[PDB]
Design a protein around this ligand. Structure first.
Ligand SMILES: OC[C@H]1O[C@H](O[C@H]2[C@H](O)[C@@H](O)[C@@H](O)O[C@@H]2CO)[C@H](O)[C@@H](O)[C@@H]1O
Ligand SMILES: OC[C@H]1O[C@H](O[C@H]2[C@H](O)[C@@H](O)[C@H](O)O[C@@H]2CO)[C@H](O)[C@@H](O)[C@@H]1O
Length: 490
């Protein structure tokens, strides 16, 4: 039956649906838009549950009232919800049209201890997310950063228990860094970065610096220092001593650093996921994380942009499968945030390979037997973008005699706006939804298309770092069709 080829479609709600003052501004306005989505066959919506709004007043001073009103409306409109535990700031990244800082009281601590923020070689502090360096430092009025994230998720679970029990919430996306993605803020627009700059390493806060220095000493090279020849945000790889042919990235020093740098992210995600699993244990929901799609410089040996962001991915070293393997113990979903792009849409001097990157990441996930979901990186309303998303959703087309051998768990579209609801654009969107559903009408019961949600079980045992890193072995990706068999057309 065709329904087994059905891939659910979700739509991101506007940023700021509940403002910085914790007020659900326009319920009536949202309602009409939501009803539009319901009529279009959309399965659900995604929303940021901003930490900076909810725990603003002070430690454990949560106010969930506005969000309870929003969830109630979503439920009345017959839509499911993907909730993001957004522990980051909204404002400094592409598309951020509203400013939502992290809790003021945390910012207050940062005034006396500037090292709680990611820091570049020049010493500029980025305030959008707390550095992984303080994950386990009890410097926030007695709590560590992870305990804060943990308490937040537990409070959410208890205060939204009725919505969880009624099955409104489908999955919990755990924010792990800038824009909620598990990565370092290596390409900050707020600091002058412009595509396709290689970006900069963000490991200079005193906590990470000390950890690194202790690490190199134990490795027998106490004299090794953090990179000093990697250039600046907008540089090109060949102009740096670190990324050029036979450069530092290829030396023992460079390899040790890149391994250390990338491992920090793996442990950061693993530890916070442990807390997320405890907070939602028993709930009929799934856990997910977001991985950024850094396609620029993907086609040169140095993969500079990926490296500075924390993804130690080279032609002979898979830096994404280790992440997938880590997610397996938590039964979590890997959400890739760049699915609509085509190589030919990128400037030549950027050496972009978004198509190849997508194939590597998704294949890595299916290889490790975890569920993979995705989102488009930039706003798109044209058929070519939708057709590329559909292609990646079912790489080998639909199976007329059962489920496809390969398919994504779901796709979330960025973002709900007046532009999307314009007659012509919305008209194409409807065809996109139909094709994602493999020509089937909207299906209310996920069980029909094998997407039944069972109670979250405790995570499996800890997987040692050496076992995780075995996943760096390069593998050939799964075969991809040149174009989808479920085209939207034009
Ligand atoms: O509302 C979700 C999320 O949206 C934005 O981040 C996106 C980004 O725009 C995409 O290009 C891609 O990277 O996925 C990101 C995560 O979904 C906001 O910047 C972010 O704050 C917000 O949480
Ligand atoms: O900021 C992260 C994104 O940067 C690029 O997006 C470019 C886009 O390609 C270009 O057409 C436009 O003029 O500028 C934006 C920068 O905001 C990458 O293409 C994206 O993949 C990144 O997510």
């Amino acid at each position: 039956n065709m329904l087994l080829n059905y891939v659910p479609v979700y739509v991101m709600l506007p940023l700021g649906v509940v403002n910085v003052d914790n007020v659900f501004e326009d319920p009536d306005g949202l309602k009409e838009q939501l009803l539009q989505l319901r009529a279009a066959g959309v399965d659900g919506v995604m929303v940021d549950v901003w930490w900076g709004i909810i725990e603003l007043k002070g430690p454990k001073q949560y106010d969930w009232r506005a969000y309870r009103s929003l969830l109630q409306l979503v439920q009345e409109c017959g839509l499911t919800l993907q909730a993001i535990m957004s522990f980051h700031q909204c404002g400094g990244n592409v598309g951020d049209i509203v400013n939502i800082p992290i809790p003021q009281w945390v910012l207050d601590i940062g005034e006396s201890n500037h090292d709680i923020f990611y820091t570049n070689r020049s010493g500029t502090r980025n305030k959008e997310y707390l550095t992984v360096g303080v994950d386990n430092e009890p410097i926030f009025h007695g709590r560590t950063a992870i305990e804060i994230y943990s308490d937040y998720m537990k409070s959410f679970r208890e205060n939204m228990s009725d919505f969880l029990e009624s099955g409104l919430i489908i999955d919990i996306e755990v924010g792990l860094g800038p824009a909620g993605e598990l990565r370092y803020p290596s390409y900050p627009q707020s600091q002058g970065w412009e595509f396709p700059g290689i970006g900069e390493f963000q490991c200079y806060d005193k906590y990470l610096k000390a950890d690194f220095k202790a690490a190199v000493a134990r490795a027998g090279h106490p004299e090794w220092e953090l990179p000093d020849d990697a250039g600046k945000y907008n540089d090109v790889p060949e102009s740096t001593g670190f990324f050029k042919s036979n450069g530092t990235y290829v030396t023992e020093k460079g390899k040790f650093f890149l391994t250390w740098y990338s491992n920090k992210l793996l442990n950061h995600g693993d530890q916070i996921l442990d807390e997320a699993n405890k907070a939602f244990l028993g709930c009929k929901v799934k856990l997910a994380i977001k991985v950024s799609g850094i396609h620029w410089w993907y086609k040169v040996e140095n993969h500079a942009a990926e490296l500075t962001a924390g993804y130690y991915n080279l032609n002979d070293r898979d830096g994404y499968r280790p992440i997938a393997r880590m997610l397996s113990r938590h039964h979590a979903i890997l959400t890739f945030t760049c699915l609509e792009m085509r190589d030919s849409e990128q400037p030549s001097d950027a050496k972009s390979g978004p198509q190849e990157l997508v194939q590597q990441v998704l294949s890595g996930g299916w290889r490790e037997d975890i569920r993979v979901a995705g989102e488009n990186a930039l706003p798109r309303y044209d058929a070519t973008a939708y057709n590329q998303i559909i292609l990646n959703a079912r790489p080998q087309g639909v199976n007329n005699n059962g489920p496809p051998k390969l398919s994504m768990f779901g796709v979330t579209y960025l973002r709900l706006s007046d532009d999307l609801l314009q007659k012509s654009n919305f008209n194409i969107f409807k065809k996109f939804v139909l094709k994602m559903h493999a020509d089937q009408d909207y299906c209310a019961n996920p069980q029909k298309y094998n997407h039944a949600i069972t109670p979250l079980k405790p995570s499996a045992p800890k997987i040692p770092i050496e076992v995780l890193l075995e996943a760096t072995k390069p593998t050939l990706p799964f075969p991809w069709l040149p174009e989808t068999d479920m085209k939207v057309d034009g």
